[PDB]
Amino acid sequence: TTVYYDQDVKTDALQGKKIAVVGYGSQGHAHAQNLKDNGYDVVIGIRPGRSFDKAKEDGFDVFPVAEAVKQADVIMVLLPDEIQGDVYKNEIEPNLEKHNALAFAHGFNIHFGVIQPPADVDVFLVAPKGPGSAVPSLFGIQQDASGQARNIALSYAKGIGATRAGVIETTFKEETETDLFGEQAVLCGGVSKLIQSGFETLVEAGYQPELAYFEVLHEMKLIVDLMYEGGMENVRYSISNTAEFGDYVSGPRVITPDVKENMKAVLTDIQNGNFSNRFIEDNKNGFKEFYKLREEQHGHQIEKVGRELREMM
Amino acid sequence: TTVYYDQDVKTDALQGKKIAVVGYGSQGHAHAQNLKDNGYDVVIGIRPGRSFDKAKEDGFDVFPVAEAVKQADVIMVLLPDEIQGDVYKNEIEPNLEKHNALAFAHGFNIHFGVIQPPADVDVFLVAPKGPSAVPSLFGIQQDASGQARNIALSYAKGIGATRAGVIETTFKEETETDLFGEQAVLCGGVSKLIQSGFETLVEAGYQPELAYFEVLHEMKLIVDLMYEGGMENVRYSISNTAEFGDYVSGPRVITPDVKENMKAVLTDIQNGNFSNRFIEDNKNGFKEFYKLREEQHGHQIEKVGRELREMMP
Numbered sequence: 001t002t003v004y005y006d007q008d009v010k011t012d013a014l015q016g017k018k019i020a021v022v023g024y025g026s027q028g029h030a031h032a033q034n035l036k037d038n039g040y041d042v043v044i045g046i047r048p049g050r051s052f053d054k055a056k057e058d059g060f061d062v063f064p065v066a067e068a069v070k071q072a073d074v075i076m077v078l079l080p081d082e083i084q085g086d087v088y089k090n091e092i093e094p095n096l097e098k099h100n101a102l103a104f105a106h107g108f109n110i111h112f113g114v115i116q117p118p119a120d121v122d123v124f125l126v127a128p129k130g131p132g133s134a135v136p137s138l139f140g141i142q143q144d145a146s147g148q149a150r151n152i153a154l155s156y157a158k159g160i161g162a163t164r165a166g167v168i169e170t171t172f173k174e175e176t177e178t179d180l181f182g183e184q185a186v187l188c189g190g191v192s193k194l195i196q197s198g199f200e201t202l203v204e205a206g207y208q209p210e211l212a213y214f215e216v217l218h219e220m221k222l223i224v225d226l227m228y229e230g231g232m233e234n235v236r237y238s239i240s241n242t243a244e245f246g247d248y249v250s251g252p253r254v255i256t257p258d259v260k261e262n263m264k265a266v267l268t269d270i271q272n273g274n275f276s277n278r279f280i281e282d283n284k285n286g287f288k289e290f291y292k293l294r295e296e297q298h299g300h301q302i303e304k305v306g307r308e309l310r311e312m313m
Numbered sequence: 314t315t316v317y318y319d320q321d322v323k324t325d326a327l328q329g330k331k332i333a334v335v336g337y338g339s340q341g342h343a344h345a346q347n348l349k350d351n352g353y354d355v356v357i358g359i360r361p362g363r364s365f366d367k368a369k370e371d372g373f374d375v376f377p378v379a380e381a382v383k384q385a386d387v388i389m390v391l392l393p394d395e396i397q398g399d400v401y402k403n404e405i406e407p408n409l410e411k412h413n414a415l416a417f418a419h420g421f422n423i424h425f426g427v428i429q430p431p432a433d434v435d436v437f438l439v440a441p442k443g444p445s446a447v448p449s450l451f452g453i454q455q456d457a458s459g460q461a462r463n464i465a466l467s468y469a470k471g472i473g474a475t476r477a478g479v480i481e482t483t484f485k486e487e488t489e490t491d492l493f494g495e496q497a498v499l500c501g502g503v504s505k506l507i508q509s510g511f512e513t514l515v516e517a518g519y520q521p522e523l524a525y526f527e528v529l530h531e532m533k534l535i536v537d538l539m540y541e542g543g544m545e546n547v548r549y550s551i552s553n554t555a556e557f558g559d560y561v562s563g564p565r566v567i568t569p570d571v572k573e574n575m576k577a578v579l580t581d582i583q584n585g586n587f588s589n590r591f592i593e594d595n596k597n598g599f600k601e602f603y604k605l606r607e608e609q610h611g612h613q614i615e616k617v618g619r620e621l622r623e624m625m626p
């Protein structure tokens with residue numbers, strides 16, 4: 001466990017260099033504005049559109065992506081994972097230089113070999129956490145060509161404010177596989193069908209879908225907020241003895257040990273690469289499987305019940 | 314599917330009636346001063362203790378439970394499910410008069426037969442969900458005076474539960490949906506899912522800190538998006554990779570067997586098995602309850618959260 005804080009970072013390896021934040025999403029605006037706030041020459045390279053325009057109205061200098069990397073000394077690629085492959089080949093790699101940084105916030109395209117950087121460029125990762133009211137961030141290194149890849153990555157995490165709560169060192173493999181697993185097994189995929197199958201149980205049992213919507217979904221924010229502030233022991237403390245007791249004896253009944261075996265099964269396909277190439281080759285086929293799965297989820301009763309409760313009268 | 318607000322309570326039944334709220338917890342104090350601020354005669358009924366005169370020093374004239382029930386016409390019991398059965402039989406029921414009104418915020422003791430009220434008394438329920446504005450629940454067990462629904466709905470505004478709406482339900486539905494939500498999704502289901510996800514990453518060799526982030530700490534952002542714009546807002550705000558993993562791995566982790574495990578939990582809540590199991594352990598000194606809560610405190614997840622939250626402002 002190596003944790004670097006603001007006082008741990010001593011030199012300013014980032015000053016004197018120009019920064020190219022590729023893309024202007026929620027994280028692109030967060031990185032780009034946090035650097036100019038600390039007196040850094042930050043540039044933004046994105047395609048023309050509504051986020052191109054928005055970056056202009058926020059006082060930023062927006063350019064095509066092929067010129068922004070020509071201009072800068074550190075390129076932070078914050079584009080969607082599915083489009084980073086071809087944007088790197090047609091707009092970033094032909095305009096690369098020597099001894100300067102190819103940064104990322106997620107190591108999907110790097111760890112899975114989709115983006116192969118040359119030897120004479122530093123390739124690091126800096127992944128902010130939580131608000132992106134400070135949560136420790138992560139950072140890692142794939143290549144060290146300039147001899148200052150560590151101090152460039154750590155001073156960049158300091159520039160975006162990621163070192164205020166401390167940055168934890170990791171690898172491109174560890175950040176990619178733990179991020180992908182949490183989304184699939186717990187946070188997104190795991191919880192959503194956990195809420196769906198609970199909602200379907202109550203509705204099929206003759207209970208009102210509105211009362212079922214509160215008990216399996218809307219009431220979770222309070223439980224999750226308690227866990228976010230004081231951990232799981234805070235939830236067990238704040239909830240009633242009847243609720244805490246039911247947690248203990250019925251939790252393992254729902255999440256049987258076989259569910260844990262399913263989590264290790266999906267983690268295996270994240271490590272070998274079965275998930276990555278499946279998500280990529282479906283993207284090359286117009287996202288047919290992806291879009292069909294997205295649209296079919298809207299046919300669930302729980303989503304319609306939710307919007308009807310939100311459009312109250 | 315119908316909802317009642319302040320504009321639907323055309324007639325106030327609580328006018329000129331002394332109301333006793335048995336207990337003085339955070340819920341007992343919220344009811345007691347809400348009705349007093351809206352022009353209602355309220356009196357606290359509680360045993361002598363540090364919270365007895367705590368209610369007296371807050372501007373209430375507080376009597377023992379036996380006398381507070383006698384001089385009142387609407388008796389509201391806001392005490393834990395473990396204690397309601399005893400003080401009702403020993404203090405409430407002997408002093409209960411004809412055409413009175415027995416009130417509750419939860420229907421555990423009524424639906425499971427722990428508290429069996431007389432036939433000549435009104436029994437209703439008002440269950441808030443806020444302590445933002447969310448709709449509340451209400452129901453009527455018995456209607457002796459012929460005004461049990463009028464007294465319940467006007468009491469809903471006395472506490473201030475009308476302005477966001479009140480949805481009708483029964484004691485059976487309010488109790489079973491509340492118990493199932495905690496046992497199958499909210500507390501039992503989610504925390505066991507997070508534990509199995511955390512154990513999977515630590516047993517695979519990943520850092521426990523990054524494992525704590527991606528299965529617990531990042532959930533607050535996801536649940537906040539689901540609280541604001543439903544489940545559709547989650548898939549809309551997360552990346553395509555997280556959205557794609559949601560669809561392809563969610564059903565892998567939560568298999569159809571997980572759903573029928575929740576039907577077993579709901580079955581044990583319907584036939585009263587879970588209730589008397591909880592009462593059996595309470596009458597034995599909560600021996601298995603406190604053994605279970607110490608096991609959970611020994612999980613690696615909790616100590617990792619403590620050392621990770623201490624570095625957060």
Ligand SMILES: Cc1nc2[nH]c(=O)n(O)c(=O)c2s1
Binds near residue numbers: 239240242243491495
């Ligand atoms: C902070 C909270 N503690 C509890 N305990 C329960 O039993 N139910 O049902 C709840 O909704 C809540 S909320």
Ligand SMILES: Cc1nc2[nH]c(=O)n(O)c(=O)c2s1
Binds near residue numbers: 551
């Ligand atoms: C609102 C959020 N959308 C995403 N998408 C992702 O892929 N990861 O990894 C995240 O952490 C988050 S948070």
Ligand SMILES: [Mg+2]
Binds near residue numbers: 179
């Ligand atoms: Mg992430």
Ligand SMILES: [Mg+2]
Binds near residue numbers: 491
């Ligand atoms: Mg509840």
Ligand SMILES: [Mg+2]
Binds near residue numbers: 240492
């Ligand atoms: Mg409850």
Ligand SMILES: [Mg+2]
Binds near residue numbers: 106179180552555
């Ligand atoms: Mg991700």
